[PDB]
């Protein structure tokens, strides 16, 4: 009827439970594909549903309900918020979801509700899912035990660094800024070739973070420190220009701001400086950003010290902020603070896993087929005796048994022969089949070599990473300064 537990024990089995889950299955990204579980399910469900960059947009509510019912047993609003986020290109260096409609602004006004919006996987998102149908990655049972879901994605690009993550669980938090796709891949390629590469050298390829919001990142040293240990504090500062206006008045013009910074709040807080006269000099503050440009104009009074003003805003507003690296991720089911090296190496180990898996799978298909084709060719040699045998067999089973026993076909071949349609009997061309037999024998040799030879395999993985870079490469947005 009733049962006693101590306050000591009760607070253990409970916080233990929550702690574990929040760490493995909520707040922290997997080190390999760079996704938290909610994002993985969004991409996987959308992809299962054929909701891809090359097909019509699909109503958000439909995507969200499917995710909720099949994969992610939580609130629809959180799922949607996460979906929306992956579509905001001022928060993701490479957006994974393409969303038609009001998905928000840098001003942080609310996205249209899911009843109003439509969405689909972006083309690049496709590459995160590349080869998932080829048994390349481990699956688990969903919460319902009704369907299998992937525990990680194949990740044909290094999403963790490219898009970043953030980042608050229990006992742990995470902050990993986004990077330039091209730079990240260059490092990965160099590291495939030189596994023991040091950070200094890696940084000739991957010099630092690249925010979608651009701006200026300052502190080569703290960057080095973060790539080394996973923690570091760099400075991010707005891109500014001065503009002389008529009558001795100057004007400060902002064109880029720091990552994760809300434009409307920034502008307001700058205007608060003017209203409070915390510092003398400010005439007016204007947000002049339009549908195709970000432009904040801070007009100064005549004979006003524009150095003092700009310096004050840098210190007391978010015109300039500190950005703290705190690269934590899930490696081998546990949280790890990691620098650039573990990250790149975990990635490479993962691709290896995938490419091997991908290749075993394709090779198995080629084999099962080649095996059938070999039988068909043979059968043609003895058609009449084979039709007679089937004609004398009591049923499907008996016919297969007779095929094995009298002419040494295997089960798999027997089953293919016995389920041929009558019209096939009209064919007697062995050549076309022999051409297929040759094409398959070649494909199997290539695939077998990838699996048997570490270097052939690593070439493949370099070849593919370069194809991705050539396709999705965009220029740096953030400038680096020491």
């Amino acid at each position: 009827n009733i049962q006693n537990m101590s306050l000591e024990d009760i607070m253990g089995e409970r916080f233990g439970r929550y702690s574990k889950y929040i760490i493995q299955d909520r707040a922290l990204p997997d080190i390999r594909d760079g996704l938290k579980p909610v994002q993985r399910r969004i991409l996987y469900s959308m992809n299962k549903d054929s909701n891809t960059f090359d097909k019509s947009y699909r109503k958000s509510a439909k995507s969200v309900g499917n995710i909720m019912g099949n994969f992610h047993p939580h609130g629809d609003s959180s799922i949607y918020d996460a979906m929306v986020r992956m579509s905001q290109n001022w928060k993701n260096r490479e957006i994974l979801v393409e969303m038609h409609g009001n998905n928000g602004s840098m001003d942080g006004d609310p996205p249209a509700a899911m009843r109003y919006t439509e969405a689909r996987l972006s083309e690049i998102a496709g590459y995160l899912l590349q080869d998932i149908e080829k048994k390349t990655v481990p699956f688990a049972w969903n919460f319902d035990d009704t369907e299998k879901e992937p525990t990680v994605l194949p990740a044909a690009f290094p999403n963790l660094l490219v898009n970043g993550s953030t980042g608050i669980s229990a006992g742990y938090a995470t902050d990993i800024p986004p990077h330039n796709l091209a730079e990240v891949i260059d490092a990965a390629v160099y590291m495939i070739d030189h596994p023991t590469a040091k950070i200094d050298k890696l940084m000739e390829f991957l010099p630092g973070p690249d925010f979608p919001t651009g701006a200026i990142i300052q502190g080569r040293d703290e960057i080095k420190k973060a790539y080394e240990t996973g923690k570091g504090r760099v400075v991010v500062r707005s891109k500014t220009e001065i503009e002389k206006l008529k009558g001795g008045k100057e004007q400060i013009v902002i064109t880029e701001i720091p990552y994760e910074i809300n434009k409307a709040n920034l502008v307001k807080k700058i205007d608060d400086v003017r209203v409070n006269n915390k510092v003398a000099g400010i005439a007016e503050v204007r947000d002049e950003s339009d549908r195709d440009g970000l432009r904040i104009a801070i007009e100064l009074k005549k004979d006003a010290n524009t150095e003092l003003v700009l310096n004050y805003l840098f210190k007391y507003t978010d015109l300039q902020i500190n950005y703290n690296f705190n690269m934590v991720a899930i490696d081998n089911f546990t949280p790890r603070q990691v620098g650039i090296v573990p990250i790149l190496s975990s990635y490479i180990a993962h691709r290896r896993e995938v490419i091997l898996a991908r290749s075993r799978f394709d090779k198995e298909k080629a084999e099962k087929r080649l095996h059938i084709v070999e039988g068909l060719i043979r059968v043609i040699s003895i058609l009449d005796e084979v039709i007679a045998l089937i004609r004398a067999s009591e049923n499907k089973a008996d016919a297969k048994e007779n095929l094995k026993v009298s002419y040494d076909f295997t089960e798999e071949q027997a089953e293919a022969i016995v389920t041929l349609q009558l019209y096939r009997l009209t064919n007697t061309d062995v050549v076309v089949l022999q051409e297929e037999e040759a094409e398959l024998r070649e494909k199997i040799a290539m695939l077998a070599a990838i699996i048997g030879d570490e270097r052939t395999m690593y070439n493949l993985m370099k070849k593919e990473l370069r194809e991705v870079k050539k396709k999705f490469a965009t220029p740096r947005l953030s400038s680096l300064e020491d």
Partner: protein
């Protein structure tokens, strides 16, 4: 709720009355902040022909319009001190969109006649096909996505088609016959149900 235009100017500034918060956002984003303001209407608007003038003054949607348009209401209404030269009604191009226009129009008629009488009240025509507004213009672009509402378009999409003063079209509501309009608004919006039922039976072809 109101998103102001940057500068004040009773001669250029326009007031878009958008149906819904969500499209109010797409519109906040799409607009030209220097002269276009946005005011979202949350929910169906109160029928100012049916409800008591008390429940009316007390309605939050109505009060905030009387203030932002800024000229008072009804018999104490001075066109002179208004804030906008163009009040633009912008709804989904669906049936509930039509209803909202209806409701608003009978409010400007009843409580701000001078505004509608000077041709200051327009209606924005959003496109229905993706660009072409009329089925006719449709088949003509197939020689060379059916929009269910405003929320379907992106901000750059909104501006180009319906908010950009150069590229847009607007149904400008002029009162042609004072008598034949008073009767039309009443049969349709007033207390009495029978006449309305009859009007529908006469004018609406259920094919």
């Amino acid at each position: 709720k109101l998103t102001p235009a940057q500068s004040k100017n009773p001669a250029k500034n326009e007031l878009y009355l958008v149906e819904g918060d969500s499209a109010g956002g797409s519109a906040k984003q799409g607009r030209d902040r220097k002269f276009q303001a946005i005011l979202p209407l949350r929910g169906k608007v109160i029928n100012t022909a049916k409800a008591k003038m008390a429940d009316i003054l007390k309605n939050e949607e109505i009060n905030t319009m009387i203030y932002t348009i800024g000229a008072g209401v009804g018999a104490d209404f001075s066109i002179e001190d208004a804030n906008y030269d163009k009040i633009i009604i912008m709804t989904d191009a669906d049936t509930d969109g039509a209803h909202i226009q209806t409701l608003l129009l009978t409010f400007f008629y009843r409580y701000m006649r001078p505004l509608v009488e000077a041709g200051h009240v327009y209606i924005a025509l959003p496109p229905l096909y993706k660009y072409a507004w009329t089925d006719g213009e449709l088949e003509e672009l197939r020689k060379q996505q059916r929009y269910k509402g405003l929320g379907e378009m992106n901000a750059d999409q909104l501006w180009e088609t319906t908010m950009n003063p150069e590229t847009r079209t607007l149904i400008r509501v002029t009162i042609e016959d004072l008598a034949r309009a008073e009767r039309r608004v009443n049969v349709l919006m007033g207390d009495k149900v029978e006449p309305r039922r009859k009007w529908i039976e006469d004018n609406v072809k259920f094919t």
